[PDB]
Symmetry: C2
Subunit: 429 residues, 2 copies
């Protein structure tokens, strides 16, 4: 890569059939020439070797990732965090858009990842810190996946929930409870006005609270509350387990009255999800364990937005992401980039429902709605429904009322002056 | 967690049946009391809520992760990297050992991860930066997995390779070559003295070089070279693909003479590997795309050693990790912690073979052997075999000779004075 091999790794937009390429945005820091560095980064990520021994061959035009656009400013301080490097001289901070020919891997999630962030990206020579900021896919490519089966669209219709956010609740306590008093809490929160009562991320099929039995009881409690309130209610059962057992658990949960399924997206593997999507009959919902390990630092890793794109692409109808509140340690606009990622038009792929976490209560709803900009989101209290002083039923109610205020454009604490549950929650949280 | 709920999340070694617990080592930074912080971290990771409404219940002793040991020193500077936080006052740097009751998830990889590094760990209140440094499992728990089928033990016997490192080679170029001139390069490198010729991480089943045909030709070239040298040779086929197609590709490759299979561990999902292990008939090898995104930074994420433990545990017989050389941007001792991780006695789980990456040639072999401490490792040149001036056959030879020197305790450049291939390689690299 030292000579004028560098030339063959750059291209103008105008010159490429952009339909054969996925666009990538990297921010990175490198030592020495930032032009060499970018080329090296395309090289490692794709060709790396374009001739054979002594052939004039160059299969760069058909197979090499190519720099579309590059931007680099000096930083005499050195790298952001201390690391250790294969180079000296100046250090630059860079922004690159690379066009990667997708014909290289075809339409499979595992192969995509291991190209756009395998060896190529992280062990490129002289580039210690690097962060993938976004992917863009062409229609032809997107057309190969199915994305969500339902989307916000579908989910809304299953709940008869229109022009208002979807109200989730994580039953608490979870870990430690046998299956019976579990249905109790769920039952109540639904009556109070919850749409969906969900299992905690860390609660699947275990000795002390088997899924077989949880779902049976919660399915009942669900059909019971649904009939008694006349509005459809939904039990969201966590079926996170070894990949082979995923299909088995889908059936067990659905047979027992589970309205939707929750999977821990990263731990099981996105490819796993895509396979369940082909078989699943109810909406699929992603939780966020693990994503944080590689998405938090601003100068390194992969932007959580990229994940969101992929989760949507893979088949999730709902994406639980980290939300607002300072207790969530994620930059404001970063969260919004994800909410955008979920809802953005994306070729034939349906928009999925974003669900910002954080310790939410009747008090924080007003805020989330302001910050989301519209009613197209989920809302997931834990305490604040099950933690409410008046009990779970009233905790749910408190949210419903908090909403009632916003939807009528009445500021919240005002409405709270005439509704005991909403007032209690404002006091408590 | 504000009151003396804190008490129930600490325990002395002496007090616990350590067999019910997995030990975890976290390094983190927190704001305000480090004692509250650690308790919160156990809480979030497990119980978080141990009563119901108004019951004296406390199911902390059976279900809550517990602080065995804690260590915390002040840092007036604030956090290492700039972040943003839910707290003020002093900032402390901490080291904790937490015992997590594994009865919480049972013996399943996805559930393990989503506890020991889901919400609990990364969104614990007032703890922005955190790194999982090590896991330790009890026999009872370990006994539930099978770990590697073959191990170094098995791999050594397949190759008749004893008392010397296993010599791998990544065929180059890869991306861009049709299947025919591929077999050519593989054939030669085996004849030169390579044990295993492998596909690049980024080369699976694609239009321009389908696995059906690669493996057919390379299987031939392998049987051919194996007969001609009288020593067993092996073709290592990459079968990275969508989870459901994994079983199909095992069969296609094995049927075609593939001696071992390579999977990209992270992109496919570790749960996926574990399922393949139940069905695979040849050794399994893990490559390292993606691990870097969450393991590089010293102050945040998950130490790659933890990954290695899990890969071994899942079923890999060989783990390709990032190696030495500065071009690899990983701390020396970190690489060694992984080499240790692979070989360490681990209950009924077999030791698997560690394979340090880096741009290795006949020149670096002497070094790796000194640094590994023994002959129990793989060695993976790319160029340096296929890049060698005299051609691939001679490139393989150069390594073989480099080894011959070491095994006789003759310093390398000395032996090179009488072997043209070793000399050329020393010049070239």
């Amino acid at each position: 890569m030292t000579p004028d091999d560098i030339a063959g790794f750059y291209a103008k937009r105008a010159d490429l059939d952009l339909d054969n390429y996925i666009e990538l945005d990297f921010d990175f820091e490198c030592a020495g020439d930032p032009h060499e560095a970018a080329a090296h980064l395309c090289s490692e990520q794709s060709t790396a070797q374009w001739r054979r021994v002594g052939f004039d061959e160059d299969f760069r035009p058909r197979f090499a990732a190519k720099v579309l656009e590059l931007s680099a400013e000096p930083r005499p301080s050195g790298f952001s965090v201390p690391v250790e490097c294969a180079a000296r001289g100046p250090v630059h901070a860079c922004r690159v858009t690379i066009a990667h020919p997708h014909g290289n891997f075809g339409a499979k999630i595992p192969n995509l990842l291991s190209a756009v962030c395998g060896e190529g990206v992280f062990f490129s020579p002289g580039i210690p810190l690097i962060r993938l900021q976004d992917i863009r896919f062409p229609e032809p490519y997107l057309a190969a996946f199915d994305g969500p089966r339902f989307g916000i669209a579908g989910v809304r219709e299953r709940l008869q929930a229109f022009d208002r956010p979807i109200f989730f609740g994580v039953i608490k306590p979870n870990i430690g409870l046998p299956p019976q008093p579990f249905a109790e809490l769920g039952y109540q929160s639904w009556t109070g006005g919850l749409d969906i009562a969900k299992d905690d991320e860390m609660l699947a099929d275990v000795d002390w609270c088997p899924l077989a039995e949880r779902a049976a009881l919660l399915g009942d409690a669900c059909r019971r509350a649904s009939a008694e309130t006349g509005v459809p209610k939904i039990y969201l059962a966590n079926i996170t387990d070894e990949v082979d057992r995923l299909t088995e658990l889908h059936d067990v949960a659905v047979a027992n009255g589970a309205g939707a399924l929750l999977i821990n997206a990263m731990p099981v593997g996105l490819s796993a999800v895509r396979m369940l999507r082909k078989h699943a009959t109810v909406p699929l919902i992603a939780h966020f364990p693990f994503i944080a390990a590689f998405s938090r630092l601003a100068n390194y890793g992969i932007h959580s937005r990229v994940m969101t794109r992929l989760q949507r692409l893979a088949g999730f109808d709902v994406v639980i992401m980290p939300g607002f509140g300072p207790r969530m340690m994620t930059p404001e606009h970063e969260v919004l980039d994800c909410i955008r990622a979920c809802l953005e038009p994306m070729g034939p792929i349906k928009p999925c429902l974003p669900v910002p976490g954080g310790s939410d209560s009747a008090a924080t709803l007003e805020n989330v709605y302001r910050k989301v900009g519209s009613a197209d989101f989920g809302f997931v209290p834990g305490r604040g429904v099950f933690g409410h002083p008046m009990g779970p039923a009233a905790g749910a109610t408190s949210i419903r009322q908090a909403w009632d205020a916003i939807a009528a454009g009445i500021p919240v604490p005002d409405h709270a002056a005439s509704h005991p549950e909403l007032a209690a929650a404002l006091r408590a949280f």
